[PDB]
Amino acid sequence: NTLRPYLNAVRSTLTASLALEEFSSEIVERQSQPEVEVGRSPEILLKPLVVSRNEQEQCLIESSVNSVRFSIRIKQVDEIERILVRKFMQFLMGRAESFFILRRKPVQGYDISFLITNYHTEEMLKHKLVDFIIEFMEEVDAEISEMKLFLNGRARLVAETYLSCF
Amino acid sequence: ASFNVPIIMDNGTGYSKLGYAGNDAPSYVFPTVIATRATEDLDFFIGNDALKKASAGYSLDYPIRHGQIENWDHMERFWQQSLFKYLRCEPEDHYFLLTEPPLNPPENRENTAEIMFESFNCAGLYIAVQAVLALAASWTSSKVTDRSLTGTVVDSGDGVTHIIPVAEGYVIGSSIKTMPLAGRDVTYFVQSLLRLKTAERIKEECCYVCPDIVKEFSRFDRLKYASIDVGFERFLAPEIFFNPEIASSDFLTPLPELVDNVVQSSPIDVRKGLYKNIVLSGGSTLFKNFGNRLQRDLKRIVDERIHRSEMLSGAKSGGVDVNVISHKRQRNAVWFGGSLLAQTPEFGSYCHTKADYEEYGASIARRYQI
Amino acid sequence: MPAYHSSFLSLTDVPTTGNIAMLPLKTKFRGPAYPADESQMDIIDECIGLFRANCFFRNFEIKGPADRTLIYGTLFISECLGRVNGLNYRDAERQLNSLALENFSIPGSAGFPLNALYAPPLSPQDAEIMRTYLTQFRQELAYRLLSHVYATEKDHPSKWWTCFSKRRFMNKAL
Amino acid sequence: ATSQVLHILPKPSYEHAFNSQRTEFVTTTATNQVELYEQDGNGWKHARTFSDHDKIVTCVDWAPKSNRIVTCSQDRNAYVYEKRPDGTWKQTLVLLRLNRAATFVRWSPNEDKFAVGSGARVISVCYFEQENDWWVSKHLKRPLRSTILSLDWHPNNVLLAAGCADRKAYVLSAYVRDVDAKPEASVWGSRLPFNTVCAEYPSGGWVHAVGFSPSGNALAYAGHDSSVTIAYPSAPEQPPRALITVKLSQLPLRSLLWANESAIVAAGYNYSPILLQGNESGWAHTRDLDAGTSLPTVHQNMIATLRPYAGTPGNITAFTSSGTDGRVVLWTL
Amino acid sequence: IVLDNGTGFVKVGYAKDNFPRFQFPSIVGRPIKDVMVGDEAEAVRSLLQVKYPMENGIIRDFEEMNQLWDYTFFEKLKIDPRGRKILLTEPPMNPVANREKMCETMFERYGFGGVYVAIQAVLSLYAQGLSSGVVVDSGDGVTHIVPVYESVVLNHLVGRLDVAGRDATRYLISLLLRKGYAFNRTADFETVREMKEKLCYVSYDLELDHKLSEETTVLMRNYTLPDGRVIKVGSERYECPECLFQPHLVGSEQPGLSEFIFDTIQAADVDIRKYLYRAIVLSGGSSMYAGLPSRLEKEIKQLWFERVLHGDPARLPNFKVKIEDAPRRRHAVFIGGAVLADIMAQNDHMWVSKAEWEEYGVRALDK
Amino acid sequence: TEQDIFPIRNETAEQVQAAVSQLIPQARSAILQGLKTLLSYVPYGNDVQEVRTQYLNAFVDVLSNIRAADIPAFVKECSTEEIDNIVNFIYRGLANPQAYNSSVLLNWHEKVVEISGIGCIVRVLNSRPDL
Amino acid sequence: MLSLDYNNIFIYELLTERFSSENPSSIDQVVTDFDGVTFHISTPEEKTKILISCYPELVNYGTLDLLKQIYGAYVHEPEMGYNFSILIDLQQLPATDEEKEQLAMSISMLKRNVLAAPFHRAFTKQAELADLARKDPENAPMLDKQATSQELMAIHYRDEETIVLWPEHDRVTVVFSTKFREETDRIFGKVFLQEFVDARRRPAIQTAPQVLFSYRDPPLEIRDIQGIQKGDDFGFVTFVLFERHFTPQNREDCISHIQVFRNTLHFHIKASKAYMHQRMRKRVADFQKVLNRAKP
């Protein structure tokens, strides 16, 4: 099982890299802006760490002083799971105001990308969110598996109720 | 295919309206409720079916509360069921239309658009305000007999009433005064003056409207048996709303005073037009000899505002142009005007098709036009 | 508003006493007022209608005697209707007489609210005048009610006239 | 073993800012407003608040000897509050021209001037101008080239430290001509001029603060790379005699200091105060102050800046710490 | 002591004061006194027809202004109208008839023995300690600008921009309406103004603005209306002040706040630009937005090194565009006048006191 | 490069491109023995990219072809520099899971994080700008 | 609901309400059903004469015989529009015990009744072929191959839809067409049509007909049709009708069950999509609750 080692590794690296501090943009005055979107910010950004357990799934763990980013590529082999996760991430990022953390336009080449700032780290605990990330990932995986398993029942029921009428 | 007959559906509390354009009577009417109950978790009645199967409907809760959509998981089910098993309509054949109470929030409007667009994979969405939909129905009268979006929409419901003026089509909800008094007040009044189903049957069978009780009583001494006697209750019923003190002294502010305050709160420049013509929404405050009663009350209350102001200020203001027009059948007139508004060739020039959504998402779902 | 206005009192001249004024009318018993110029419309007849219309009202703007007399008439009519609501004609007339031509002195008795009855009390210089006026007015109103409400039956008044006496002026019914 | 719990303070503390007698502490609330409390039976209580600020206040300080209070924010300027004899706190502004927002402020030992952590490429210092009511401005462009994060004032009117953003640890000096304080010579620099620099110590990453032994020598500093470094300079042109870099295994820390002449204590992101000895030819970690390492530890959040205790200038054997969720604690040893 | 008659609002305070004392707007009501004034016209404006006599540097309600000044001298100052002196200043480039009428009034109505009518821009520039320079006086309705040199402003370089706070608020409400909401132009003109200065900040980054607005949520905020409804504002917070830099968007063909300033600067000789470059400041609407100094500095640098003659950035440090950002830019001219009136008080060389009160001859130019 | 980066130009040894090959050869010939040579010298951050990629691939292959019976022995028997270097190497090798399996890499990362400390990951995160 | 109704609920309710009512009022409604059709329920002149209101393809083929034989003399002028009007009166009824319900059901199923005429000729041809190849089982293949490609008819009930049918020996097969305008709907239809053919393996339902699938490789015999050829956004499914199901004893229910095959699939797909949306909303609510609880 290569799932628990990867989960432990991502949890540990996230807990180690989660360090948000207040910083004023040295370019523009009296406007707190990010450090991964505006300008370049060469001497502030850290090395983007990445962890992977397979070829179709990975997560880019980027770090900064006040612009830490995080993204994961959900596993997908068939078109069913592909379109399922596509629609799920679309509907989840559409109403980004609910969580106040998710983004609207994820980075190119990825499915979903989160976003955390100093305010988000102070309004909530650290280990709580660290565990909630893994819990949400596992719950999304299980829900996708169920939906894949939930369509067969409806399909066979429709088949049996449409062929038994005669 | 961009030319078929559109569909108008004004879903709200209690009874929900739904049908087609180019008509005068509703095709279906029933209360908004579903008889919700391993697998096969989709067997639940709707409308009259649920009202009859309540025996085993297992707590047929209501899916709508205070007009605003609160249970989307059940609202979508109700919508799809009413569209498939009670309308037999093809979604990929013509345009659609949704309902939204006054001041509907962008969040809820976008949620409704997204749940009614991607779920059924339709093509064409359109949402408007109840005020404009009700005002467009009064165009059939000989007063306007044209397109003139200027006036006020006083929605008097069964539970509560409200008013939402419109300034040249744009409803300005900055100053509004709602009247909690509704049909329930008159129902309780009638029930108390005779010491649910029987009360409603007695209230929806005979209801007079008199200028004043002092004259109603004088004319009464100079009557009907159904269902068990009647009397001055028919004369006192309507006054319960005109003079709240008769029914409930809590909201002493009467209807004429509320209308005057609402029309005077806005700038006078636009109020001079708003006070010209007004239309009532729904068919609750539609009693025999009712509209003219409110017109007389307003033209009598405006005395101390016009005649006295002319002498106080010293300027002849010939603003005698108020003329209230009452609908003939407003019980389901919320879509009567919508049908005429959608039958215009330019109805499709202010909508969004699949090409305007597939490459834009749920962003363009709030800004509309006439 | 739907209240019953006085339409008789003014601010020019009237035989007021304490907190109310005088209203000459036609009556059989002794009265303090004098004969009016014409009997086209007496005040005792309009008071009955005012009370019948205001029985289901909240209150009325007390403006001198115009409102005090109307409130007194409405209260008297309500009391008469409650005492002869569904009783025999003989007992009803007996109670009406015992309430109109009784020994009731000037207003200001205990138990009942003194503010709603008569705010400014003026017993001296008008005691007998006010007493005889009240007696005559009560007798006339009681007789007029017994003659009008009484239908063609064997002294049976209108059912609604006695069944619509649930409320009173200012909620002074229970 | 030893612990203490005060007002939960459901706001980002980031500071302690004790008073002269250490009875009226001030703390920020991520807003222009300020929260002040007074001593009460087994706890504090709300006493007064400050206003007139535009953006969130970041750093404040109060010299115990003078009983003054100075504040700064990201509003292009800083304010100073004075104790009014009527029973309140006065407010006064200082005229200083800057290009970016400030991040940190530190008072002077002898209470004659102060430094501000300007986010621009220059550092400013102000003082009381004679025959005037406002405080003159100041700026330096030669030594510094990037923004600064932390600041520290050596026990003197010279050799003002400065924590630059880059991996280098810069150090400046402020010697005003009007100020009669003579710049006595030391090991850092003899007869140093107005503007000068001692050495740019390359750190193992970021920098959060700089330490100072109670005597004055044995400079130190920490960073985000979970490591602390010391220094023993012998001359402004010679290299350090002993440059030992110890890397702790736990999470990094910030806002270090020198508890004793040899022992050093500090805290930060890690949920446990560290305790280690110090020598000129040796170094090693002994243990942590926590005795329990939802969570087993006491502080279940990030630790904020750490200030020392009154004690004695030579040794204090005590300090106080807090976090982003308040819950200030007054440790010992 | 003195005051500053403004178009929209007006201030008043003692001379050499640390901060202003009174602040009242030029919006008189009409119904509680006979005619609302200041507080009586603002707090009770719900049942009174408001009116703004001062507008566009001119006036139309003479009795209204008279009552305003009477109430001011009565309550706001608590000093005798004739046993005291004042020093006012109208907007720049104003007509001479208004000044003559103000002098005649101050002389023959209140009995003032000594007054003074100077230029507000001159006082705003002197408050910062500078005798020669420029000032961006973005008024409430018109943004007037004029240079200063040798204690006198150059009338040739005088101008006025069509942009102002009114157009800004109009575009803000229009964007809030077209964004999905259904508001009115006059439904609530105070909540929009309170939200603008509270959540809007000018930024000269158009490529990054929409990017951060459509790719992040940190820009989103939560504002509370007066009734209780929770309203949201997104990318419409930074686009509001953009109308100042793009007059064409408000329906007025104009170069811009920076383009016009440049065209006026390089319009004069090079001998004055050397000192005018190090005096680029603003006092009013053009000095209160967040991020305006950096934006205008970048615009000036761009139009400097890419407008006249430049092919490479080999001499970008030769020209220094000094753009000072005074925190008290709103009361800059007020403080300047308050500090200047004290130097001319004891001075007996002012040909106004004892001459512009009752001793009026046939010449009134030296005023 | 100019700031926040200690090494700037090391053409003296970078242009040679021989020490890395010599170290990789001994490790390959030997393949608790790999880390001795593979970690004795880290790829010097410079303008050389092919040699660095080859050394990284060789180190990843050596780590994969190692005895995974009792890793704790070598995990505990190593200096701070060695553990930091191997952690950084594992982090840089886990970026391309197509060529390598990454399972052994993730296992070694988890073991060194749960056996040594919870600060090695944070220390390796702040590495050189181009090294 | 697991089976779509074949009778219009609106008409089935209006007729049964007007038959028992005693105050018929004016009606000016315009109801539309599936397959792109429109109805017109209104009275031309009087208030009681209820005048209830792709077609040329069936007119040129011949379908009015069965409609007339089933409806009697209730036909009326073409009434330009739907092209099939009917005159009904609520005063000259023959009885009210069950004739009212029968007439209501007939007027409601008029759609299928009109769309069921092409099946009578197919039934007749199949019976004739079975009678021809009854005593001589041999020689049937070539005769059947020669008795096709000429009698098969194509129905055009939509701008893009198309259904064809041709007779066989001892059985009869049909084929449908569909046009999916989305990838998720395409995948749903694919999995549904796969489960359909996979379900027949069960012995309890082995007696059901055989169903095949063809996405991009349509039958070569039907490829000669002038309709749409093989396409990427198209899917054809073939069915078979045996004699046991095609027997006249039970030939009235199978036709109505098959006439709603194109809509049942889309209805079930949309129901599944609604269930997916509901589950997603539930998960989002759970995540929001967890996030709100994460606060201190």
Ligand SMILES: Nc1ncnc2c1ncn2[C@@H]1O[C@H](COP(=O)(O)OP(=O)(O)OP(=O)(O)O)[C@@H](O)[C@H]1O
């Ligand atoms: N002619 C009439 N005169 C008086 N009352 C009537 C008349 N017609 C209907 N009503 C009553 O008016 C009330 C409101 O009817 P209406 O159809 O307007 O409700 P509604 O707006 O759909 O209600 P809700 O807002 O609760 O959904 C009901 O009690 C109804 O029976």
Ligand SMILES: Nc1ncnc2c1ncn2[C@@H]1O[C@H](COP(=O)(O)OP(=O)(O)OP(=O)(O)O)[C@@H](O)[C@H]1O
């Ligand atoms: N917080 C704020 N930030 C920026 N602008 C603001 C703020 N509050 C108000 N404003 C705008 O400031 C303008 C008025 O500025 P001010 O009162 O200084 O003008 P003024 O000096 O009276 O003008 P004039 O010289 O034209 O008479 C209006 O556009 C107003 O909406």
Ligand SMILES: [Mg+2]
């Ligand atoms: Mg309604």
